[PDB]
């Protein structure tokens, strides 16, 4: 059980991260106009709210820990549950770590005016250091998590307050909503994906649904309030960015938040805001490392991965399964060496939203195959909100496939590599 306000804070903390500080580059480089990027943010938030409600329904139906793995295992089959676990193990969490390490290195270089050639070495060093820190037990990781969660709200609030009162802010800063050079149809998909990365992490509402005290009255209010607060914060931050900088200026830099802070609080305030952004990125990497470490243990304890004994090995000193962390760190380093922030974020969004759309279809199927299950929480408008979430997910998947064949091919190839691993592991019993 958890208090209603406590769940609100949990949702706001998990969803909000370092995407808002860096994704505006992609959003306003694709959209190309101040108004279309804001529309992308709003649409992404609406889709996130609908998906959160839909996922929370099944989370209440199946309160067992694990999340999408458990949901898809129970609805479709064990093979798809393992497929979700494997995709999270080899794409989602490694790519999140790689992308956040790359952006941390980029922001660090910008802050300290170092050469751009040190971005990859930095990213690698910080990823290794954070993984090693997480290997020393949950104490330091929890301390970092709490500190980053507390501190990441300060730069956002400061930027919003300062930019909204910038000398020149006004409705004129949000025009013309479209530039002929960027067609609305093609560019809006890329803008939507870029915004959707900033909303990542909302899938934990389903996991928290089972823990919630009294779903069905607090769960809808909690989810709607938390995701609406996240959407409002993102919209206000983007409005502040547009007040301080133009759409072209935001698209022309890899650190929009740093540039806006430099314009707002010249002197030491810009440096402090940049350090806050770096701390937020650090906390994001740490949280992703923890959540990712939790996955290979779950897969191995069910004898679903090769050398499941090795993966499920528990460290006597810290009582942590380290080997899965090492595998994820290796994959993340490989991604860092041969990847980019925007590309990795797009891949993450593509794979996670494919599986999330599968989860929505699972909710719809459960509403039909097993109408008699005890449902503590029912989605508000069954024929409308799940349909909106599924339409959003399908649009994301198809737009990414059409616009980024290489990224979609990479994700599909990794998952299809996972499949024969599943069959071999079933044959050999771990």
């Amino acid at each position, epitope marked *: 059980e958890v208090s209603g306000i406590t769940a609100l804070t949990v949702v706001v903390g998990t969803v909000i991260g370092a995407g808002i500080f860096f994704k505006p580059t992609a959003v306003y480089g694709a959209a190309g106009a101040p108004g279309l990027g804001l529309l992308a943010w709003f649409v992404a938030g609406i889709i996130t709210i609908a998906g959160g409600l839909t996922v929370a329904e099944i989370g209440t139906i199946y309160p067992q820990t694990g999340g999408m793995m458990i949901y898809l295992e129970k609805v479709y089959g064990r093979w798809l549950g393992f497929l979700v676990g494997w995709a999270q193990m080899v794409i989602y969490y490694p790519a999140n770590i790689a992308a956040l390490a790359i952006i941390f290195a980029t922001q660090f270089v910008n802050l300290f005016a170092l050469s751009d050639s040190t971005i990859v070495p930095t990213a690698i060093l910080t990823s290794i250091f954070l993984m090693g820190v997480n290997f020393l037990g949950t104490k330091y990781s929890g301390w970092i998590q709490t500190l980053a969660t507390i501190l990441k709200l300060i730069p956002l609030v400061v930027i919003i307050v300062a930019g909204l009162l910038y000398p020149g802010g006004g409705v004129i800063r949000l025009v013309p909503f479209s530039v002929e050079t960027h067609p609305v149809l093609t560019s809006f998909g890329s803008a939507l994906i870029a915004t959707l990365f900033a909303y990542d992490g909302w899938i934990n509402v389903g996991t928290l649904a089972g823990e919630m005290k009294n779903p069905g009255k607090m769960l809808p209010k909690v989810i709607i309030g938390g995701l609406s607060i996240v959407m409002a914060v993102y919209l206000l931050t983007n409005i502040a960015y547009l007040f301080v900088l133009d759409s072209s200026q935001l698209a022309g830099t890899d650190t929009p938040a740093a540039l806006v802070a430099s314009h707002l609080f010249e002197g030491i305030g810009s440096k402090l805001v940049t350090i806050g952004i770096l701390i937020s990125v650090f906390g994001g990497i740490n949280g992703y490392i923890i959540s990712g470490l939790r996955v290979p*243990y779950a897969l191995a304890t069910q004898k679903m991965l090769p050398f499941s004994d090795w993966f499920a090995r528990i460290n006597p000193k810290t009582n942590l399964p380290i080997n899965g962390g090492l595998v994820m760190l290796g994959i993340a380093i490989v991604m860092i060496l041969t990847g980019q922030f925007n590309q990795l974020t797009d891949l993450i969004v593509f794979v996670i939203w494919f599986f999330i759309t599968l989860t929505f279809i699972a909710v719809i199927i459960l509403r039909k195959t097993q109408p008699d299950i005890e449902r503590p929480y029912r989605v508000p408008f069954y024929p409308v909100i799940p349909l909106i979430a599924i339409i959003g997910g399908l649009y994301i998947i198809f737009n990414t496939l059409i616009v980024q064949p290489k990224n979609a091919f990479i994700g599909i190839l990794l998952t299809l590599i996972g499949i024969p691993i599943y069959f071999y592991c079933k044959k050999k019993y771990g």
Partner: nanobody
Amino acid sequence: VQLVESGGGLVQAGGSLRLSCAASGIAFSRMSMAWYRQDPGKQRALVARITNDGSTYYDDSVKGRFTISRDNAKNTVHLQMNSLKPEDTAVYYCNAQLVAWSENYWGQGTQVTVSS
């Protein structure tokens, strides 16, 4: 989920006590059983842990003297505190945790003190 300890008590320095800890209601074979130390007005500090696969970890201050052993047949864990020393006096708890992020199961806690 109970964890009943025993074996602690007053002992002369340099003695040897074994702290049995019978665990019931948990998947003992799958759990990593540990022994913690909580000095007065402090927080529990790990003394020794043994994983489900037999791998063991010992605190630097007890390494070479303490020996943690588990026997899944009777669902008990022992801690042979050989060559006790006066600073070793504290209250020793019996823990049973599946994984670092799982729920921690604690015993009633046993008091062991070294007279000399």
